Write an enzyme that holds these catalytic residues in place. Sequence first.
Site, PDB file in Angstrom:
ATOM      1  N   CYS A   1      -1.369  -2.756 -43.949  1.00 64.73           N
ATOM      2  CA  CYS A   1      -0.213  -1.864 -44.167  1.00 64.73           C
ATOM      3  C   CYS A   1       1.084  -2.659 -44.272  1.00 64.73           C
ATOM      4  CB  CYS A   1      -0.085  -0.754 -43.141  1.00 64.73           C
ATOM      5  SG  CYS A   1       1.269   0.352 -43.702  1.00 64.73           S
TER       6      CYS A   1
ATOM      7  N   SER B   1       4.551   4.247 -38.858  1.00 61.74           N
ATOM      8  CA  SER B   1       3.997   5.506 -39.388  1.00 61.74           C
ATOM      9  C   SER B   1       3.013   6.104 -38.403  1.00 61.74           C
ATOM     10  CB  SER B   1       3.324   5.289 -40.702  1.00 61.74           C
ATOM     11  OG  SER B   1       4.210   4.693 -41.627  1.00 61.74           O
TER      12      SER B   1
ATOM     13  N   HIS C   1      -4.078   3.044 -39.045  1.00 60.45           N
ATOM     14  CA  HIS C   1      -4.350   2.792 -40.469  1.00 60.45           C
ATOM     15  C   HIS C   1      -4.163   1.330 -40.871  1.00 60.45           C
ATOM     16  CE1 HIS C   1      -0.020   3.420 -40.180  1.00 60.45           C
ATOM     17  NE2 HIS C   1       0.134   2.759 -41.353  1.00 60.45           N
TER      18      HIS C   1
HETATM   19  N1  LIG Z   1       5.861   3.505 -48.170  1.00 61.80           N
HETATM   20  C1  LIG Z   1       4.842   3.039 -47.447  1.00 61.80           C
HETATM   21  O1  LIG Z   1       3.736   2.806 -47.965  1.00 61.80           O
HETATM   22  C2  LIG Z   1       5.047   2.735 -46.037  1.00 61.80           C
HETATM   23  C3  LIG Z   1       4.184   1.808 -45.380  1.00 61.80           C
HETATM   24  C4  LIG Z   1       4.499   1.367 -44.125  1.00 61.80           C
HETATM   25  C5  LIG Z   1       5.572   1.854 -43.447  1.00 61.80           C
HETATM   26  N2  LIG Z   1       6.342   2.845 -44.026  1.00 61.80           N
HETATM   27  C6  LIG Z   1       7.563   3.354 -43.388  1.00 61.80           C
HETATM   28  O2  LIG Z   1       8.528   2.310 -43.417  1.00 61.80           O
HETATM   29  C7  LIG Z   1       9.429   2.486 -42.293  1.00 61.80           C
HETATM   30  C8  LIG Z   1       9.574   1.214 -41.541  1.00 61.80           C
HETATM   31  O3  LIG Z   1       8.351   0.942 -40.846  1.00 61.80           O
HETATM   32  P1  LIG Z   1       8.310  -0.241 -39.783  1.00 61.80           P
HETATM   33  O4  LIG Z   1       8.946  -1.469 -40.304  1.00 61.80           O
HETATM   34  O5  LIG Z   1       6.952  -0.273 -39.228  1.00 61.80           O
HETATM   35  O6  LIG Z   1       9.310   0.425 -38.690  1.00 61.80           O
HETATM   36  P2  LIG Z   1      10.252  -0.120 -37.533  1.00 61.80           P
HETATM   37  O7  LIG Z   1       9.698  -1.317 -36.915  1.00 61.80           O
HETATM   38  O8  LIG Z   1      10.567   1.070 -36.707  1.00 61.80           O
HETATM   39  O9  LIG Z   1      11.542  -0.627 -38.290  1.00 61.80           O
HETATM   40  C9  LIG Z   1      12.636   0.258 -38.663  1.00 61.80           C
HETATM   41  C10 LIG Z   1      13.928  -0.467 -38.407  1.00 61.80           C
HETATM   42  O10 LIG Z   1      14.976   0.415 -38.817  1.00 61.80           O
HETATM   43  C11 LIG Z   1      16.094   0.172 -37.972  1.00 61.80           C
HETATM   44  N3  LIG Z   1      16.979   1.313 -38.067  1.00 61.80           N
HETATM   45  C12 LIG Z   1      16.839   2.564 -37.484  1.00 61.80           C
HETATM   46  N4  LIG Z   1      17.880   3.307 -37.861  1.00 61.80           N
HETATM   47  C13 LIG Z   1      18.678   2.577 -38.670  1.00 61.80           C
HETATM   48  C14 LIG Z   1      19.944   2.799 -39.335  1.00 61.80           C
HETATM   49  N5  LIG Z   1      20.542   3.963 -39.243  1.00 61.80           N
HETATM   50  N6  LIG Z   1      20.391   1.831 -40.075  1.00 61.80           N
HETATM   51  C15 LIG Z   1      19.779   0.638 -40.186  1.00 61.80           C
HETATM   52  N7  LIG Z   1      18.652   0.338 -39.521  1.00 61.80           N
HETATM   53  C16 LIG Z   1      18.150   1.335 -38.772  1.00 61.80           C
HETATM   54  C17 LIG Z   1      15.479  -0.036 -36.618  1.00 61.80           C
HETATM   55  O11 LIG Z   1      16.359  -0.601 -35.690  1.00 61.80           O
HETATM   56  C18 LIG Z   1      14.216  -0.844 -36.942  1.00 61.80           C
HETATM   57  O12 LIG Z   1      14.381  -2.244 -36.772  1.00 61.80           O
HETATM   58  C19 LIG Z   1       8.902   3.685 -41.490  1.00 61.80           C
HETATM   59  O13 LIG Z   1       9.497   4.917 -41.881  1.00 61.80           O
HETATM   60  C20 LIG Z   1       7.420   3.741 -41.927  1.00 61.80           C
HETATM   61  O14 LIG Z   1       6.860   4.999 -41.743  1.00 61.80           O
HETATM   62  C21 LIG Z   1       6.100   3.215 -45.308  1.00 61.80           C
HETATM   63 ZN   LIG Z   2       1.816   1.898 -42.103  1.00 62.59          ZN
END
Ligand SMILES: NC(=O)c1ccc[n+]([C@@H]2O[C@H](COP(=O)([O-])OP(=O)([O-])OC[C@H]3O[C@@H](n4cnc5c(N)[nH+]cnc54)[C@H](O)[C@@H]3O)[C@@H](O)[C@H]2O)c1
Ligand SMILES: [Zn+2]
Lengths: 374, 374
Positions: B174, B48, B67
Amino acid sequence: STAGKVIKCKAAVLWEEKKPFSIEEVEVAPPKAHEVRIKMVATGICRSDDHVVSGTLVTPLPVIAGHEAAGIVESIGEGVTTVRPGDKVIPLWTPQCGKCRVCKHPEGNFCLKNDLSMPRGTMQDGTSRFTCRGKPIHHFLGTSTFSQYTVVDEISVAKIDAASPLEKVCLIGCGFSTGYGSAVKVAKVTQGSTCAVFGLGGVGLSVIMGCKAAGAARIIGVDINKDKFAKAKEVGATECVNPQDYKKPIQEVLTEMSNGGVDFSFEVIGRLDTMVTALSCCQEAYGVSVIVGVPPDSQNLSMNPMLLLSGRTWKGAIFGGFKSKDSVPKLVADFMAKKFALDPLITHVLPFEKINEGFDLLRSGESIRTILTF
Amino acid sequence: STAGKVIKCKAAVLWEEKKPFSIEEVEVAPPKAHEVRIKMVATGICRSDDHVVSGTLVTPLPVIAGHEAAGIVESIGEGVTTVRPGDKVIPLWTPQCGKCRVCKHPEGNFCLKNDLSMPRGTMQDGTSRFTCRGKPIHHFLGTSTFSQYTVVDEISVAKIDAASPLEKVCLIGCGFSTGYGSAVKVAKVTQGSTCAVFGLGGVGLSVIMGCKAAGAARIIGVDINKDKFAKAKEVGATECVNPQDYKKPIQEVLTEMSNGGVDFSFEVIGRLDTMVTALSCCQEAYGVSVIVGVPPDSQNLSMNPMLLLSGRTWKGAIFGGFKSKDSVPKLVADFMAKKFALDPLITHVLPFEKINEGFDLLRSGESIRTILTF
Ligand SMILES: NC(=O)c1ccc[n+]([C@@H]2O[C@H](COP(=O)([O-])OP(=O)([O-])OC[C@H]3O[C@@H](n4cnc5c(N)[nH+]cnc54)[C@H](O)[C@@H]3O)[C@@H](O)[C@H]2O)c1
Ligand SMILES: [Zn+2]
Ligand SMILES: NC(=O)c1ccc[n+]([C@@H]2O[C@H](COP(=O)([O-])OP(=O)([O-])OC[C@H]3O[C@@H](n4cnc5c(N)[nH+]cnc54)[C@H](O)[C@@H]3O)[C@@H](O)[C@H]2O)c1
Ligand SMILES: [Zn+2]
Ligand SMILES: [Zn+2]
Ligand SMILES: [Zn+2]
């Protein structure tokens, strides 16, 4: 005797979309193994039957529609154990096979034997029991209740109390149970909560009944037809609002009225726009919105997933979430024990021969439920 | 001492989208009433934070992002009662005011004081504590942890165990808590269930941890980067699948693998298409899908509401559904008692000064969490 014989009887056949029903003679085959032939006593006019006419709900034509009904068993096929000739019954347009992963799940009710997802318009065995003018006629949701006699699979019928007034309890076959269970079982409305109900037809009034039974403090009815408001208040609505009366979108109005969003909202119409409005008007962090209305065939809605990310829950349900064969007899028993009322839903009682007039009353906005009597 | 005085320190300032952070001196004002100034010890790189850079998550620029962090209170403003100078703390990017309707609700956690829904990039009082080159700089989610010192509102900080290893427990701020709570609190994964987790980054790995802690029998990881699969299996995935390997859409593959759809699915990426795919792959009558990924700003998804009408539940959540100030100290205590592990998430450690290399590692696909040390 009729048992083991073809019955020639009257039915309402829908030969093509957007035309009146044709009230004419059909042939009804006797039941095969694990099938039940029912002499119908009363059937309600649900908006979903009108969806077949309008092409909102796609199912093979020509068809005998009707799914909200009650009748008396005329005969049973080999191997039937759950009903006997003479029993009062409600056909189940959502079956309960008892064997599929959904039937075995504590919270599933949309049995995999249903004919709603991918309609074939047949019995479970892929054939039809109906002939009209020498042509095979499709079934509808395994029930086909717009006929003096129908044949259903055993998993699509429930035995009910022999003392049941069939001209009332037919509503437990669809509209009452769907609305009431959408509130009490699917949403799980809480005491002291604020609810918003979009659509104040038979199903939406039943949602209000359930929200009131669950102890909601506020139940806001929403309809573009203000003629629906008096009966909504009679069955528990505390306020009614007509979106047409406002310059702002009604989601904004409802958010303001509820001091930041409602606890529970219900879409009970069948429009993509009101499904998104109903989601939006529930509180963003902990609100719940339930889709009840049948959407127009093959159309997608557009929405911003931040509505969900903040914490909203969006769900839908068939038949109020009730496991149909377990639930229908208990709901009839509860009605007999005065646990809920059905009369507020019934605005018209017509002979079956007036089916087309009954549909015209629905389409004009003038009825809630018409009950047709055979 | 520094109490009551402006602190000059280094921070990572984002002046423009799609540009490297600038590590340079900022002025950090002392805390006003009900504010807390924190000397940061460790901060994680969450996707994020990268969304701020890419314009996926819109917040006013210029900004100090960050954050997911932990530090030590340097000073408190007038009236602060919940932390003291010298306490170890985790900033809370979802506040817990304790007074709004969401904070009072048993299941709400997205406190109405948050700065995520409609970001202003300020303190609660609508002003900034940061100056750089004589220019005011925005806060991010009330936390701004990419700085040697930050100032947060008291409702945006939690006191944690004095013996906490801050270079590990920053992940409770987070990614761990989000993923783990999304499984255990929001979805309420059940023993013996089948789960599908889309996205195997730090948050998706924490979802897997939660699904395993809840006793899921099958946890299917889904990622287009097969390099992610080994760690997913280490923390509990039973199978991993790469959609790029299949001719058919992965919702169909997962439906086949699960003999008719999964019990629980999680979108942990941030794509509209995978939010719909994740919903579709859960069982149509009783499945639950949780959106965790942050969607691209102001974009709408398209979906067929029949996916919900059959019985699916679709929800999203912020911060794993945890009430942040109540929950973070308990999660730290549970970590100290070895109730869950954080090391599997930590792939890289860098000094704060190497923040841009930390973002390069995330963007290349190589890292899960890089922890930056001040
Ligand atoms: N709701 C919340 O409170 C909250 C909190 C923390 C993170 N987030 C979100 O959660 C998401 C994941 O965060 P993260 O784990 O730090 O990110 P990250 O480490 O970028 O993990 C995302 C994963 O998705 C994989 N990916 C990308 N495209 C695809 C696809 N088409 N199909 C399958 N896999 C794919 C990618 O290879 C990676 O391993 C992000 O959008 C953050 O912004 C939300
Ligand atoms: Zn986060
Ligand atoms: N999910 C299920 O199992 C299930 C069961 C039964 C019925 N249904 C569906 O539920 C819906 C309601 O059925 P019903 O109560 O028999 O129908 P109905 O009696 O036609 O009631 C619909 C109500 O919606 C009102 N309405 C129409 N447009 C709007 C609008 N834009 N805003 C607000 N109100 C509007 C209308 O005036 C009427 O009072 C239909 O789509 C049915 O097909 C679903
Ligand atoms: Zn079944
Ligand atoms: Zn119906
Ligand atoms: Zn609050």
